[PDB]
Coordinates of C-alpha atoms and ligand atoms in Angstrom, one line a residue:
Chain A
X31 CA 61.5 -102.3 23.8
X32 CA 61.6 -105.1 26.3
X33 CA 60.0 -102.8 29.3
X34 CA 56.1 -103.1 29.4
X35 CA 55.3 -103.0 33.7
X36 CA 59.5 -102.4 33.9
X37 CA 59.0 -98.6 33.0
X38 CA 56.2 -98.7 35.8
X39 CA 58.3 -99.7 38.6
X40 CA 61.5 -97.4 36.7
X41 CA 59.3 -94.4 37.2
X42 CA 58.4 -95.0 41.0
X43 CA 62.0 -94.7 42.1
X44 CA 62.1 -91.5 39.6
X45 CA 59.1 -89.8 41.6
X46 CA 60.7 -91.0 44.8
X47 CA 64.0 -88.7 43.6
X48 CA 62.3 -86.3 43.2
X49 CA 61.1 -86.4 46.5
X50 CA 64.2 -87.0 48.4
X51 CA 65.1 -84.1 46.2
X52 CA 63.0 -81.4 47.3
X53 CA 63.8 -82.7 50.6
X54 CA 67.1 -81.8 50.8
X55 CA 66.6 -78.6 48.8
X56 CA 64.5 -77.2 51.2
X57 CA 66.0 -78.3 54.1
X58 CA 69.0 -76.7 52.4
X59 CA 67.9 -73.3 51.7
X60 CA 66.0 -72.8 54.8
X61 CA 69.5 -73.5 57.0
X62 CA 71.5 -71.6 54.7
X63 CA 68.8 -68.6 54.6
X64 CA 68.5 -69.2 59.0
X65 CA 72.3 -68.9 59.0
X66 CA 72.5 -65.7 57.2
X67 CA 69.7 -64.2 59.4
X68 CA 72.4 -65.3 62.2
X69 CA 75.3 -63.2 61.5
X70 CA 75.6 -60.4 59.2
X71 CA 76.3 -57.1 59.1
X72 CA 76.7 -54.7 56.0
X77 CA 77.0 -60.4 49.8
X78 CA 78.9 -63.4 49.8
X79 CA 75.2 -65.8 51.0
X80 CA 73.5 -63.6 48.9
X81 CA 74.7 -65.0 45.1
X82 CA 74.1 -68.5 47.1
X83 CA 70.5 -67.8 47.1
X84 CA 70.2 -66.4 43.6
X85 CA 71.7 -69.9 43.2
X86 CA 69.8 -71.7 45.5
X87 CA 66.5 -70.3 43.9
X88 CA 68.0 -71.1 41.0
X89 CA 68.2 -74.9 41.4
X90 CA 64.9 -75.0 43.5
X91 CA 63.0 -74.1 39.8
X92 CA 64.9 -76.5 37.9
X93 CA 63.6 -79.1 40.3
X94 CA 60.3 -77.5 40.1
X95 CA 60.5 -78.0 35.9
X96 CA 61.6 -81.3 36.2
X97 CA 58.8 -82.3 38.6
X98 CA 56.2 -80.9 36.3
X99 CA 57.9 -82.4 33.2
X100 CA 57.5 -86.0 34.6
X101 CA 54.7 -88.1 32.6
X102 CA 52.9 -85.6 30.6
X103 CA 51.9 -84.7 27.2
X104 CA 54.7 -82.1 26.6
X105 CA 54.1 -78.9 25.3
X106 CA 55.6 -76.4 23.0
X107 CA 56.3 -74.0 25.7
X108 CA 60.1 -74.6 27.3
X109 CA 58.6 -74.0 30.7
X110 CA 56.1 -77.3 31.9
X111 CA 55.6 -75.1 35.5
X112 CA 54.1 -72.0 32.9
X113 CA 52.2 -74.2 31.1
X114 CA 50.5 -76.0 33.7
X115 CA 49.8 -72.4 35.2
X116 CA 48.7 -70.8 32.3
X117 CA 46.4 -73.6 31.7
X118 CA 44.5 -72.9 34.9
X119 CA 44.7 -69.5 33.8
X120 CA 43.0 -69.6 30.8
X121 CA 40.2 -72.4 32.4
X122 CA 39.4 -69.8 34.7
X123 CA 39.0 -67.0 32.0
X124 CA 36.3 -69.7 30.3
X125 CA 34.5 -70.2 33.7
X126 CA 33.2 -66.6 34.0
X149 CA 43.8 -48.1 61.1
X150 CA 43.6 -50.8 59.1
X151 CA 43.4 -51.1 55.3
X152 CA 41.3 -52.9 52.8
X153 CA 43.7 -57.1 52.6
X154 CA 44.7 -58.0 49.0
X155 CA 43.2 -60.4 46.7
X156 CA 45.5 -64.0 47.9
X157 CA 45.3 -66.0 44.6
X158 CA 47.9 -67.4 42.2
X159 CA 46.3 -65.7 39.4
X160 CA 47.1 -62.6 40.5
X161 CA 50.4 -63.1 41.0
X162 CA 50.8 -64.5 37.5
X163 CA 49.0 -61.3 36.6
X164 CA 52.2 -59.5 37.9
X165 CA 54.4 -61.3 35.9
X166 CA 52.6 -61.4 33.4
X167 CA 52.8 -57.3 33.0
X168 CA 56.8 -57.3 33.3
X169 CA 57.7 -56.4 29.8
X170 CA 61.9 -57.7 30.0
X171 CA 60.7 -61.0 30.7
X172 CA 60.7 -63.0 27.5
X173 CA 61.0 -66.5 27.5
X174 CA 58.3 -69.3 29.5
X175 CA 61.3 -70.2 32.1
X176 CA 62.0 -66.6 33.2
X177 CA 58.1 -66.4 34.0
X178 CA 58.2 -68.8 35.7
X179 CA 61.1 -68.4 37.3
X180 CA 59.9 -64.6 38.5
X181 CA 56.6 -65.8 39.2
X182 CA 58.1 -68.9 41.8
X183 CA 60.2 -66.1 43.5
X184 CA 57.6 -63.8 44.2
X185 CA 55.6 -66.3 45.6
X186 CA 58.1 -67.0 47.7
X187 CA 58.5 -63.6 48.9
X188 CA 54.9 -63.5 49.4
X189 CA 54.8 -66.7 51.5
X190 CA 52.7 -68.5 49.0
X191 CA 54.5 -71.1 46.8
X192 CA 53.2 -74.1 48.5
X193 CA 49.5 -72.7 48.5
X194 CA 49.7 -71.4 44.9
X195 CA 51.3 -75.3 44.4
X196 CA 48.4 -76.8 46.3
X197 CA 45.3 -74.6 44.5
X198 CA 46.9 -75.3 41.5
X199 CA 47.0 -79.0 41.9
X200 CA 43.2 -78.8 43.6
X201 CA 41.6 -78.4 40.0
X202 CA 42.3 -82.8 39.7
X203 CA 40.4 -82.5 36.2
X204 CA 43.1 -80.3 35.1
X205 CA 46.2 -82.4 36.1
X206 CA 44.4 -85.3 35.3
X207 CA 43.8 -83.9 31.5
X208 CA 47.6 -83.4 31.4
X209 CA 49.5 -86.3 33.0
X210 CA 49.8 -89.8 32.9
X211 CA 48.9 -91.8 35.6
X212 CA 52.9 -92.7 36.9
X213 CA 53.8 -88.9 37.0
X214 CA 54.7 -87.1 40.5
X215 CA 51.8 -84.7 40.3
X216 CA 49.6 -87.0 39.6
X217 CA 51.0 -89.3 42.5
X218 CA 49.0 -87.9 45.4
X219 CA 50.7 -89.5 48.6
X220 CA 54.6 -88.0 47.5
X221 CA 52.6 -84.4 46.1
X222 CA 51.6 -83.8 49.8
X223 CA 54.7 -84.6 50.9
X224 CA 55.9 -82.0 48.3
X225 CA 53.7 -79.5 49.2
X226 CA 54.3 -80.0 52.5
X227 CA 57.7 -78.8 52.1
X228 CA 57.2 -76.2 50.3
X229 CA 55.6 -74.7 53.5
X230 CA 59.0 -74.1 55.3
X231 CA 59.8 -71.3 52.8
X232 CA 57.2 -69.5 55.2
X233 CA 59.0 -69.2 58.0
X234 CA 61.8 -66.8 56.2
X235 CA 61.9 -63.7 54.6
X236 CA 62.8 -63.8 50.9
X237 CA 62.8 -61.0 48.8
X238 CA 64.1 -63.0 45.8
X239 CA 61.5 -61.4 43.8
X240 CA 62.0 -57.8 45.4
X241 CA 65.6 -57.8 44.9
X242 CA 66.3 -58.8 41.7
X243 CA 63.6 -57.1 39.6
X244 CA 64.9 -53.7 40.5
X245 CA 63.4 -51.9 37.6
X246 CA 60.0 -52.5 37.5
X247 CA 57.2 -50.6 38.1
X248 CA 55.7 -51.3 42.0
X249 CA 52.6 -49.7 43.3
X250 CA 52.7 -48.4 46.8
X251 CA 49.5 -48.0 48.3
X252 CA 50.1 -45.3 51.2
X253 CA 47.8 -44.9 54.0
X254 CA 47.8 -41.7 57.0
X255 CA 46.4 -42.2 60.1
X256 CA 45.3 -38.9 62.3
X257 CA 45.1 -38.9 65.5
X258 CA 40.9 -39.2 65.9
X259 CA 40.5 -36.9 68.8
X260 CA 38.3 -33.9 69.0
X261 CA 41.2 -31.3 70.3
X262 CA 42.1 -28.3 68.3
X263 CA 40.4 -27.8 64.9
X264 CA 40.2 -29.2 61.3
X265 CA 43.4 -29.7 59.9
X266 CA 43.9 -26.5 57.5
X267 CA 47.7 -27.2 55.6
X268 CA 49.0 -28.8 52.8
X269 CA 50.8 -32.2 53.8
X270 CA 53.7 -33.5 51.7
X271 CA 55.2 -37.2 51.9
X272 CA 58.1 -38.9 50.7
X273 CA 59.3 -43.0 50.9
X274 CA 62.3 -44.0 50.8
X275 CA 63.7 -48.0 50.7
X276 CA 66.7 -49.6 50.1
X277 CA 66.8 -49.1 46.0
X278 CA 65.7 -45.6 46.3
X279 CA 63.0 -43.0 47.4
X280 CA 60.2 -41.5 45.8
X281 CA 59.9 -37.8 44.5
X282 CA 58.3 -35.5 47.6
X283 CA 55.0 -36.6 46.9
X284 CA 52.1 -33.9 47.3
X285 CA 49.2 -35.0 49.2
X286 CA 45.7 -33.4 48.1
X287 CA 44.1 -31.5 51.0
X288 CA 41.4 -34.4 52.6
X289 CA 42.8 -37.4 51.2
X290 CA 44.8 -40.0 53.8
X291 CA 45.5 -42.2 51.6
X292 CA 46.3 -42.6 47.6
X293 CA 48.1 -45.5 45.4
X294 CA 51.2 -44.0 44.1
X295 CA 53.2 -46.2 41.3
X296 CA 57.0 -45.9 41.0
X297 CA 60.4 -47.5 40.1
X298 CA 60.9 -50.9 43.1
X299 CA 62.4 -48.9 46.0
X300 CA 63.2 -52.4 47.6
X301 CA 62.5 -52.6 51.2
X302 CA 61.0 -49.3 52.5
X303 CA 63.3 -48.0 55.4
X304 CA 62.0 -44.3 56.4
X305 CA 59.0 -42.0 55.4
X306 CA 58.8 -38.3 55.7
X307 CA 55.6 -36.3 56.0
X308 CA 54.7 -32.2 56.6
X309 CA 52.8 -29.6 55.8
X310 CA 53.5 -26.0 54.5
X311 CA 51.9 -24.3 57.7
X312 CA 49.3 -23.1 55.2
X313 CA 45.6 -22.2 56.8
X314 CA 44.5 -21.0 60.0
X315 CA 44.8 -24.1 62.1
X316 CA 48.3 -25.6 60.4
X317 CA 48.5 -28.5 63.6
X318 CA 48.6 -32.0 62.4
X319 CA 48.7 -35.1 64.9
X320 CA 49.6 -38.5 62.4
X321 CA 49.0 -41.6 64.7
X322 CA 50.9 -43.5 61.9
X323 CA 51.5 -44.0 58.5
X324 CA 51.0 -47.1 56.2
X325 CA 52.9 -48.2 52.9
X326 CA 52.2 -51.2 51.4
X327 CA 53.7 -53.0 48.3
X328 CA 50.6 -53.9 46.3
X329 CA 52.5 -56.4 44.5
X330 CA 54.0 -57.8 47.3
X331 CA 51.7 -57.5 49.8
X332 CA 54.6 -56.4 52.0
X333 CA 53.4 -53.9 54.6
X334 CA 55.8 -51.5 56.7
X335 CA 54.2 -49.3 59.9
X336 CA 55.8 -46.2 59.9
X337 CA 55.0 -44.8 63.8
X338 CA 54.5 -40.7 64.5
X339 CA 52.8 -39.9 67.4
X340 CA 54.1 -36.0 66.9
X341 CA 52.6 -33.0 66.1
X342 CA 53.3 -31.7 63.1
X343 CA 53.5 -27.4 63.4
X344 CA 54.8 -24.5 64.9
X345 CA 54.2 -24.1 68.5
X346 CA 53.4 -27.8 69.0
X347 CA 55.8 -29.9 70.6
X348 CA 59.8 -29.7 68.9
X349 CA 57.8 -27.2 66.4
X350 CA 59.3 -29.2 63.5
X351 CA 57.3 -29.1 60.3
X352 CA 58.5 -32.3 58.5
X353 CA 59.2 -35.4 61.1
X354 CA 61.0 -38.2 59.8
X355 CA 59.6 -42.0 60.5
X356 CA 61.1 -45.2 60.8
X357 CA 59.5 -47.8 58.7
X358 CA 58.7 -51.8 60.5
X359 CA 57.8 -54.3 58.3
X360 CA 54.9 -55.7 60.2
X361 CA 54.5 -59.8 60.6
X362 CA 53.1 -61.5 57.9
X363 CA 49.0 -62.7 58.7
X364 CA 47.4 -64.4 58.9
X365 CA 47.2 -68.1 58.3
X366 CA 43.9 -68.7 58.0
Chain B
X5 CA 45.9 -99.3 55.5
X6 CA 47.7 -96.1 56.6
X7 CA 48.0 -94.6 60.1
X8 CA 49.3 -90.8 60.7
X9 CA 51.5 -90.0 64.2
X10 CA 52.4 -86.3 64.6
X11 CA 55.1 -85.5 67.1
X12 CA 55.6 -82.6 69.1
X13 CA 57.5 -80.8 71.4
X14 CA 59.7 -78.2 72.3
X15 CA 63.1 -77.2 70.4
X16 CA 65.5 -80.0 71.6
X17 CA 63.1 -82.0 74.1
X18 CA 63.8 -85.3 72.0
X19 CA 61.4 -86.2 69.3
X20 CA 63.7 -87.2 66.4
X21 CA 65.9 -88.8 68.5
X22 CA 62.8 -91.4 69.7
X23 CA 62.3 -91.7 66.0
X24 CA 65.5 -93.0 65.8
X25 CA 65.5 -95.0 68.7
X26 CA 62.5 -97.0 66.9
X27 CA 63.5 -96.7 63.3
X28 CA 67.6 -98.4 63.5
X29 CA 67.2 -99.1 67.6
X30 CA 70.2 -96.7 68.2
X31 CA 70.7 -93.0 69.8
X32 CA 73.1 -90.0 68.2
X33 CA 73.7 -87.8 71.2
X34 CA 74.4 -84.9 69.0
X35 CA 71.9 -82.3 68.3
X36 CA 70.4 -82.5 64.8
X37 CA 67.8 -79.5 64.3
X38 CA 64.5 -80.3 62.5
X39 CA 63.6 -78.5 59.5
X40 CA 59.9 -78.0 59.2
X41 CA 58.7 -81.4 58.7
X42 CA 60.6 -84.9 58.2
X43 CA 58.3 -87.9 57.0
X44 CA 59.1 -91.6 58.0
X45 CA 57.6 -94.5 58.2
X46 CA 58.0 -98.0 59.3
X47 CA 55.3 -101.3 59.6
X48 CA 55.0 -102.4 63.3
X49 CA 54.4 -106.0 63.6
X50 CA 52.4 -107.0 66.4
X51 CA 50.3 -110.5 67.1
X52 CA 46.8 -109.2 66.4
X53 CA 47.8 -107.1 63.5
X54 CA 50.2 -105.6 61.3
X55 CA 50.0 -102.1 59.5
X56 CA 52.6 -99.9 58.5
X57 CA 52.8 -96.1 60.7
X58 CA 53.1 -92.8 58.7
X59 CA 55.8 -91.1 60.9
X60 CA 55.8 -87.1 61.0
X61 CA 58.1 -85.1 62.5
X62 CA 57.5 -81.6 63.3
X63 CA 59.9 -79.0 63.9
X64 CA 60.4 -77.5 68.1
X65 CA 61.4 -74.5 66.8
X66 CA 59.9 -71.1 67.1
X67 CA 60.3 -70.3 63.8
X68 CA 58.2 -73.0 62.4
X69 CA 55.5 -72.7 65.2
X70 CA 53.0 -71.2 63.1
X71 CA 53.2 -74.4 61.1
X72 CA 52.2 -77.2 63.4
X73 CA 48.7 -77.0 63.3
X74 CA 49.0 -77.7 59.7
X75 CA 50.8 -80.8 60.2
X76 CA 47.9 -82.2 62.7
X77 CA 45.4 -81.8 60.2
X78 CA 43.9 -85.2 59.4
X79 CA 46.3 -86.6 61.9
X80 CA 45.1 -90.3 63.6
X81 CA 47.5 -90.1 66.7
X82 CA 49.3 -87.5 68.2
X83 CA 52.3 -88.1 70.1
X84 CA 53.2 -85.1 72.4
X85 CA 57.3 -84.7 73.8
X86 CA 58.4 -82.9 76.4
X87 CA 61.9 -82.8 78.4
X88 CA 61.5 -83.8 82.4
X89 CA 64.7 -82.5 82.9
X90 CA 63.6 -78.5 81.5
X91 CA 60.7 -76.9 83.7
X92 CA 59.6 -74.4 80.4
X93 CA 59.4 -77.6 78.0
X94 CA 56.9 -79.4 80.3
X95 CA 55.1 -76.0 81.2
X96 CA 53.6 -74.9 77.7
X97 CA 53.1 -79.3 77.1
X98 CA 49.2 -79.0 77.6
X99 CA 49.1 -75.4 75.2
X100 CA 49.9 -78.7 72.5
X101 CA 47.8 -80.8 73.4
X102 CA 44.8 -78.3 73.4
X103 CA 45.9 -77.3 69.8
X104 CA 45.6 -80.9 68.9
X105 CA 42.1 -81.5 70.1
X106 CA 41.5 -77.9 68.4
X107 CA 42.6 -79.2 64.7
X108 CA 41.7 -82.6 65.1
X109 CA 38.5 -83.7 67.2
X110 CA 37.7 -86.1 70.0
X111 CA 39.0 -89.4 67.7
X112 CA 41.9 -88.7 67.4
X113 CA 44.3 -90.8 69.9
X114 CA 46.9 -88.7 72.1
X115 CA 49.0 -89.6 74.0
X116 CA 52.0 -87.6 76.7
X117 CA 55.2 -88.5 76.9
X118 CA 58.0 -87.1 79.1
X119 CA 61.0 -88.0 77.2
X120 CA 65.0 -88.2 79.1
X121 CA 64.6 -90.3 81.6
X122 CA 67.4 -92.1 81.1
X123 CA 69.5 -89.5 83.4
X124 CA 68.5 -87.6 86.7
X125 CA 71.1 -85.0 86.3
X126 CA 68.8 -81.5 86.7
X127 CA 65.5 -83.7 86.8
X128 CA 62.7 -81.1 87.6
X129 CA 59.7 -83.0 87.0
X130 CA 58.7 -86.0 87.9
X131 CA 56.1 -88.6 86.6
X132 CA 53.7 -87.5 89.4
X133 CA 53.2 -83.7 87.9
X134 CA 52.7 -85.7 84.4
X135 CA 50.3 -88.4 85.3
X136 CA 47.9 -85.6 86.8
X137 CA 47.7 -83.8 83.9
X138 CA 47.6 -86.5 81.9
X139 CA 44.7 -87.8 83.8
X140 CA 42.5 -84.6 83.4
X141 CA 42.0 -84.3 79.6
X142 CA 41.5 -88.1 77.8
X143 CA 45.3 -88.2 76.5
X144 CA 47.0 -91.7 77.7
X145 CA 50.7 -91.2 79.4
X146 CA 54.3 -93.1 79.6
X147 CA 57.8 -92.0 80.5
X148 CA 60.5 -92.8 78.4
X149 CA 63.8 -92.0 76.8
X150 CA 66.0 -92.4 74.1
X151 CA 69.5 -92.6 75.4
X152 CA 68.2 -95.5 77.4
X153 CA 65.7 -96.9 74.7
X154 CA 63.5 -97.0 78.1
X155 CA 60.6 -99.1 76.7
X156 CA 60.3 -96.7 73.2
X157 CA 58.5 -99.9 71.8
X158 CA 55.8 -99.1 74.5
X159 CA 54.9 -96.0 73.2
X160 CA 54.4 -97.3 69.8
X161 CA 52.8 -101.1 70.9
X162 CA 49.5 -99.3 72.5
X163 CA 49.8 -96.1 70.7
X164 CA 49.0 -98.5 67.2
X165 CA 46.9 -101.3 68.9
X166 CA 44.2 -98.4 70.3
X167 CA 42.8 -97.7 67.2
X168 CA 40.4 -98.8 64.2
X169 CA 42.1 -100.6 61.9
X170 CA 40.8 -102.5 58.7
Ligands
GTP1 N1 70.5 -87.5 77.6 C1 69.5 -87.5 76.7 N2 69.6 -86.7 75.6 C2 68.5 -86.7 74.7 C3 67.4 -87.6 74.8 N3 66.6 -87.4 73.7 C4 67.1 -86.4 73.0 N4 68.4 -86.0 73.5 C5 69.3 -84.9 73.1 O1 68.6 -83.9 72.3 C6 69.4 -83.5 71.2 C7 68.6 -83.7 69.9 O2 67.3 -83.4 70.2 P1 66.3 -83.8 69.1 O3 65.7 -85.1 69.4 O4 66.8 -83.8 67.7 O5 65.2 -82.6 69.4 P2 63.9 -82.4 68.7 O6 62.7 -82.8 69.5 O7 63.9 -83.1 67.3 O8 63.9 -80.8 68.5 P3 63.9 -80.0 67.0 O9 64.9 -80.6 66.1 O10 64.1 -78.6 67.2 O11 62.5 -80.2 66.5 C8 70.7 -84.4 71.2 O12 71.8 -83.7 71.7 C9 70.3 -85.5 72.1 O13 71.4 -86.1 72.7 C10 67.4 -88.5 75.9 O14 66.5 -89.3 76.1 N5 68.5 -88.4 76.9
MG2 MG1 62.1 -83.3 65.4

């Protein structure tokens, strides 16, 4: 009705809103979440970023809701990503890296049985992203398959215009130089695989290692049960309620055997979901006669620096 | 026609504020810190030709370091900042310019600049100590400032006219 090429130009300054949008959004967030990492000690910023992330996804929705052939779904960011989903299920010292792909971190959503409705996925599965580092690449690889964006929206939409979606990307990437654990802390009932690793000492000195060792993680939402290690084995994926962000470890042995000695270099847990990886440094015997003669040594968890950026 | 200029520096050497020098010819003397990346863009008019610049504005701090090589990617011109009046800001200045050439290849135009010249207040480098540097790897060179708006339309008049165009 009286708008043929008037809609045209009506949705240009629409996409350009949505720009200056997500601008200002993320500039927000990342001075709010720099000014928390200034001062505090222990909250008040921390509701602000449940909010924060809150308004960041409706932003999100609305960007993918611009010029398309709507759904059924409630959620156009969970359809969009199930789409690619589904087109991909047709078209078929150190430890081992995980798999970096936004599948797989839908895959983790996608296995949280309280979650219900399209938004809430894809409000979970924006926020561990963003814990992870990875919303703008998830946002980029998911925008790479053109035929697919293409097959769902117009020609005016924001996706679909390439100069502002760089931009928007582009943005996206400052959420990669804080620490979130939006998805960590709020989903503190779930089920998180921690993949632990032991690292002995290599040195010839002594004798094979005869005892029984013993470990036991603790984080921020809780600890695990004293978890007991199989003679020979350095390192096992153990499954347990979200213990947040690991803080200490404990490891020992019951002296049992001839030579009960044990030199750990380190030990390494990491959140498979996550990918979060804390170093938990020894450097002590473990047994009686060597060094304090302690038994059990308790370690101090570092989450190491996220890499890399290739 | 679109042409991409990448600016880089230290935190607080003086790259926004050259940005606004050019964009509404004016200078803010308070510190505004830059977020990540800011995009801009404005159409410099010149007798020869005219095409509009695709302005992008990288962040000096730390924090968002291991982000600037993705903002050179696929960058035509590269517009490197450093304070004269800080010895550290103009000591890591070629560690940029060597990422540069690193992302980008041999095409892509660079060019120094030692920004705050307009005062000489705690000066400890001086357009000597530049221009040799600048005249070891192929990267072009020019003082300015932005308090001063010391010929900022220099930078930009044969930073745009010293490349392919149309
Ligand atoms: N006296 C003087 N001050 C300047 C000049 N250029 C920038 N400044 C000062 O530097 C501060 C702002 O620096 P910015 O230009 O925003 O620094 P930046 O390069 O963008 O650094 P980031 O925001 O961290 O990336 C202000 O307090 C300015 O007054 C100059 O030419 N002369
Ligand atoms: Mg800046």
């Amino acid at each position: 009705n009286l708008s043929p090429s008037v809609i045209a130009q009506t949705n240009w300054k629409f996409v350009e809103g949505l720009l200056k949008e997500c601008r200002n959004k993320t500039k927000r967030m990342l001075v709010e979440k720099m000014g928390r990492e200034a001062v505090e000690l222990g909250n008040i910023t921390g509701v602000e970023e449940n909010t924060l992330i809150a308004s960041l996804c409706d932003l999100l929705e609305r960007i993918w809701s611009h010029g398309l052939q709507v759904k059924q779904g409630k959620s156009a960011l969970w359809s969009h990503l199930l789409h690619y989903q589904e087109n991909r299920q047709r078209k078929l010292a150190v430890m081992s890296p995980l798999r970096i792909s936004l599948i797989q971190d839908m895959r983790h959503i996608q296995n949280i049985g309280e979650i219900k409705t399209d938004v809430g996925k894809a409000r979970a599965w924006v926020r561990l992203s963003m814990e992870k580092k990875l919303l703008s690449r998830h946002l980029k690889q998911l925008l790479s398959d053109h035929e697919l964006t293409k097959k769902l929206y117009k020609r005016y939409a924001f996706l679909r215009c390439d100069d502002e979606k760089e931009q928007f990307l582009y943005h996206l990437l400052s959420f990669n130089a804080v620490d979130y654990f939006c998805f960590t802390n709020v989903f503190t009932t779930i089920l998180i695989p921690y993949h632990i690793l032991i690292v002995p000492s290599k040195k010839l000195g002594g004798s094979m290692f005869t005892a029984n060792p013993w470990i036991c993680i603790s984080g921020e939402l809780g600890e695990t049960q004293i978890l007991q290690i199989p003679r020979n084995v350095l390192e096992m994926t153990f499954e347990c309620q979200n213990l947040g962000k690991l803080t200490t470890v404990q490891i020992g042995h019951d002296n049992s055997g001839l030579y009960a000695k044990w030199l750990v270099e380190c030990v390494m847990v990491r959140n498979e979901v996550t990918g979060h990886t804390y170093k938990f440094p020894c450097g002590r015997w473990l047994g009686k006669g060597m060094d304090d003669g302690s038994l059990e040594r308790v370690l101090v968890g570092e989450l190491l620096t996220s890499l890399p950026e290739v | 026609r679109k042409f991409k200029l990448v600016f880089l520096g230290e935190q607080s050497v003086g790259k926004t504020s050259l940005i606004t020098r050019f964009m509404y010819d004016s200078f803010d003397n308070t510190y505004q810190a830059t977020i990540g990346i800011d995009f801009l863009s404005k159409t410099m008019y010149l007798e020869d030709r005219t095409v509009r610049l695709q302005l992008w504005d990288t962040a000096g701090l730390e924090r968002f370091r291991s982000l600037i090589p993705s903002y050179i990617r696929d960058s035509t011109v590269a517009v490197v900042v450093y304070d004269i009046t800080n010895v550290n800001s103009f000591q890591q200045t070629t560690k940029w310019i060597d990422d540069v050439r690193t992302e980008r290849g041999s095409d892509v135009i660079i060019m120094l600049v030692g920004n705050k010249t307009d005062l000489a207040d705690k000066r400890q480098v001086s357009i000597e100590e530049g221009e040799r540097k600048a005249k070891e790897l192929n990267v072009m060179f020019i003082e300015t400032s932005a308090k001063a708006g010391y010929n900022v339309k220099q930078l930009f008049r044969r930073v745009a006219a010293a490349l392919p165009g149309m």
